[PDB]
C-alpha cells in the first residue's frame, strides 16, 4: 500500500548512516550486519515473558532499523581523535565519547517535530545515546546500570561488540567466531545484561552465518 515511502526512507537512512561511517569506517558492511544481529537477538527475546510486552513484532522491526543510526554522532569527533589508533588522554576520550550525546541531540530534535510520536525515532535516540552503557554502570556517557539502560541500547551494545570482534581493524584480522563467543560470554553481568548473553548464545550460530554472508569485501 504505502511501501513506496517506507522503502524510500529505508534507502535514504541506509545511505546517510553509511556516509556517517566514511571518516572512521569506510568500505564496511557494519551497518547491515548490525541490523541483522539486532533483529536476531530481538526476535529470540520476544518469545520470552520478561520482554514480550516491550518487543512486539512492530517494535522489533523499528528497533532493528533504528540501530543503523547508533554512531551518526561521530561528526562531533575531530579527525585527530577519531583517527588516533593509540591511547587517548582524558580530554580526547571525552571528545570520542561525545558521539553519543551528539547523536542523541539530533534525534531528539527530530522527535519534537512530530505530532504523533515515533517509535522509530525514540529507539534511535535511546540507542545513539546509550549504546556504550554497560550493565555494571561503568560505561558512558551517564553510567546507567541494570534495567535503567533502555532495552534497545542493551541489545545494540552486544551486537556492536560482536561485530567489532568479528571484523577487520588496523591492529588485527577478525577474531574467529568461537573466540568471539567466549569473549561476549565473559562480559555477562559486567558489560552486558546476562539475559541478552543467554539469548546471544542460543542464536550464535545464526550470528556466524550473518558474519560470513555479509563479510566485508577484500
Amino acid at each position: 500500500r504505502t511501501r513506496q515511502l517506507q522503502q524510500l526512507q529505508d534507502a535514504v537512512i541506509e545511505a546517510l548512516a553509511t556516509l556517517g561511517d566514511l571518516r572512521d569506517n569506510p568500505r564496511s558492511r557494519h551497518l547491515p550486519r548490525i541490523e541483522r544481529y539486532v533483529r536476531l537477538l530481538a526476535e529470540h527475546l520476544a518469545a520470552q515473558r520478561a520482554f514480550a510486552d516491550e518487543l512486539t513484532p512492530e517494535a522489533v522491526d523499528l528497533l532493528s532499523k533504528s540501530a543503523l543510526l547508533h554512531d551518526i554522532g561521530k561528526v562531533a569527533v575531530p579527525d585527530r581523535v577519531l583517527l588516533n589508533p593509540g591511547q587517548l588522554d582524558a580530554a580526547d576520550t571525552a571528545l570520542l565519547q561525545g558521539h553519543t550525546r551528539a547523536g542523541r541531540d539530533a534525534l531528539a530534535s527530530a522527535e519534537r517535530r512530530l505530532g504523533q510520536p515515533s517509535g522509530f525515532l525514540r529507539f534511535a535516540r535511546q540507542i545513539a545515546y546509550s549504546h556504550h552503557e554497560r550493565w555494571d554502570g561503568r560505561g558512558f556517557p551517564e553510567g546507567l546500570a541494570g534495567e535503567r539502560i533502555p532495552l534497545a541500547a542493551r541489545i545494540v551494545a552486544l551486537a556492536d561488540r560482536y561485530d567489532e570482534l568479528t571484523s577487520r581493524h588496523a591492529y588485527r584480522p577478525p577474531l574467529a567466531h568461537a573466540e568471539a563467543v567466549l569473549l561476549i560470554q565473559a562480559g555477562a553481568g559486567s558489560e552486558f545484561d546476562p539475559r541478552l548473553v543467554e539469548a546471544f548464545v542460543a542464536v550464535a550460530d545464526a550470528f556466524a552465518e550473518v558474519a560470513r554472508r555479509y563479510a566485508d569485501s577484500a
Copy 2:
C-alpha cells in the same frame, strides 16, 4: 497515515543534514534558509511555461526538500582542509571539491538500493554533485555549462550564494540585502542562469524577509 511517514522523513532528513554541517558550520540556520530560498525561486519559475513541465507542484516540493542534502558530502573532507581559513594548495582544493562527488555517490547508492525512480533522490543527487557548477562552465567538479547543468543545481547555486553573502563569515559581516541583490545580478550569464537571476529579482523582497527572520543566533 501517509502524513505520519512524510513528517518522519522530513524530520530525519533535517536532523542528518544538520549533523552534516556540524564540522564546518555549527549553530547555523543555513538549512532552513536555503530550503526557503530554493522554494521561492522554484515557485516563481513554475509559473513560467518554459520551466512548468519540469517544475510541477510535486517536483517543487521534492526539489526543495532535497536541497537540504547539498553539502552532506563534506564528511569526505578532512578537518585540516575544511577548517583551514587561508588559501589552499591545489591538492587540498581538490579534497574540498570532492564534497560534491562523495555526496553524489552516497545518494546514487541509495537510488540503487531503492531500485525504482524517486524524484526526491534524483534531485538530491543532482544537487549534491552540481551545486558548485557555473553557468559559464568554470565551476566544479565537471565544468558543466549552460543547460547541461541540471535545473535543480542551478537553482541551488543561486540560493547558496545569496545565503553565503547575507550571513556571517570570518572575513566579514553579512552584506546588506540591497548589495547582495546587485551582486547576484552581476553574476547573470557567468555564475548563474540569467533566467534564474530574473526570477530572483522578482522574489528578492521575500529573500530579504527569510534572511532576517531565520538569521543566526
